[PDB]
Design a protein around this ligand. Structure first.
Ligand SMILES: CC(C)(C)NC(=O)[C@@H](c1c(C(=O)O)[nH]c2cc(Cl)ccc12)N(C=O)Cc1ccc(OCc2ccc(Cl)cc2)cc1
Length: 94
């Protein structure tokens, strides 16, 4: 896998906007493992149908809160380094 699995176990504290986003799809806590944050971001992208229907590795967010948080108009789910950095922009480590 692109990023070692041990990275998903890191305990993190989402900043206010990201925390609001996570809770809007049913997250229940103030702190998460990175694996949990990824899961809930996945539910958000699904629920708002932001992925390209035919090219499902592309997520569009130029006009969505997700784009505000990530700082991009769209991204590929295949490029994990960028996902890591985009998420960490919105976190502090516990
Ligand atoms: C677009 C769709 C169909 C709604 N979901 C997925 O594609 C996807 C997924 C999930 C998921 O929990 O399945 N969560 C995602 C979050 C983002 Cl930001 C983008 C994709 C996912 N699940 C993929 O296999 C895709 C995925 C892609 C990258 C990924 O992790 C990168 C990463 C690894 C480790 C760290 Cl520490 C940080 C980031 C996790 C899941």
């Amino acid at each position: 896998m692109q990023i070692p699995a041990s990275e998903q176990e890191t305990l993190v504290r989402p900043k206010p906007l990201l925390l609001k986003l996570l809770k809007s799809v049913g997250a229940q806590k103030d702190t998460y493992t990175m694996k949990e944050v990824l899961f809930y971001l996945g539910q958000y992208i699904m629920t708002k149908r932001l992925y390209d229907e035919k090219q499902q590795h592309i997520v569009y967010c130029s006009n969505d809160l997700l784009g505000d948080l990530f700082g991009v108009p769209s991204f590929s789910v295949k490029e994990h380094r960028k996902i890591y950095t985009m998420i960490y922009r919105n976190l502090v480590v516990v």
